[PDB]
Design a protein around this ligand. Structure first.
Ligand SMILES: C[C@]12CCc3c(ccc4cc(O)ccc34)[C@@H]1CCC2=O
Ligand SMILES: C[C@]12CCc3c(ccc4cc(O)ccc34)[C@@H]1CCC2=O
Lengths: 123, 124
């Protein structure tokens, strides 16, 4: 069914865990089959598990950790802050992001928007 | 004009400053005259500076701090995480919230959605 707020906090937290270990198969299975991802928010969205797989394939040594609790609503949505560590121009950099997700009635991510820009990038 | 990413970070951070001191007039001014706020996200929205003034008068001893940096996009939007401290019938508590805001070409908040629920509430 439409995930409760507690359920949303556990799913959002698990998607960051899966990113962190680079488990592309498990990541893409968290998404609805026709989910849309906008990352960064403002850019054209990508649609469908195929494209979202390709995204993570290309994007993912990269680490990612929640930097605070997940915030969850009563209508299936929530938002979380996290930090991605990865290489930029040959040095270790960090990028601060917040992801906003809405879930469908099967508990899968229907949409994700990832808020970040170069102002959030640090060497 | 449409606020740049760095501008967004400044405006969103100023909004938490003005909540934290409780300056109702000043908070309300940061919003468009016909702004919509959904707080909490999922409830019916409140429209217009006047209903948003009433929200803050009713809601604001209350403190609020950013608990990490503002994430800003290039299309006048940003999100930020912060914590609100308050007292709910004698019980000190804290609530973690993330606000997502979309600014208009005058640098005022056109929409705000506040993400949280009771799962985000904590005693003391
Ligand atoms: C793609 C990326 C690594 C992973 C990642 C980025 C940005 C936003 C994300 C949001 C997510 O929910 C998960 C992963 C990322 C980085 C931007 C530059 C890059 O190295
Ligand atoms: C309204 C409130 C104090 C301020 C506040 C709440 C929730 C979300 C907020 C979002 C903001 O952008 C600014 C203030 C609040 C609390 C709910 C219980 C309480 O009294």
């Amino acid at each position: 069914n439409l995930p409760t707020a507690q359920e949303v906090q556990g799913l959002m937290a698990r998607s960051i865990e899966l990113v962190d270990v680079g488990d592309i198969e498990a990541i893409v299975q968290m998404y609805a089959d026709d989910a849309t991802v906008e990352n960064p928010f403002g850019q054209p969205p990508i649609h469908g598990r195929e494209q979202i797989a390709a995204f993570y394939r290309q994007g993912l040594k990269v680490r990612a950790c929640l930097t605070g609790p997940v915030r969850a609503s009563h209508n299936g949505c929530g938002a979380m802050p996290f930090r991605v560590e990865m290489v930029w121009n040959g040095q270790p950099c960090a990028l601060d992001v917040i992801d906003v997700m809405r879930f469908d009635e099967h508990g899968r991510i229907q949409t994700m928007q990832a808020y970040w820009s170069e102002v959030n990038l640090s060497v």
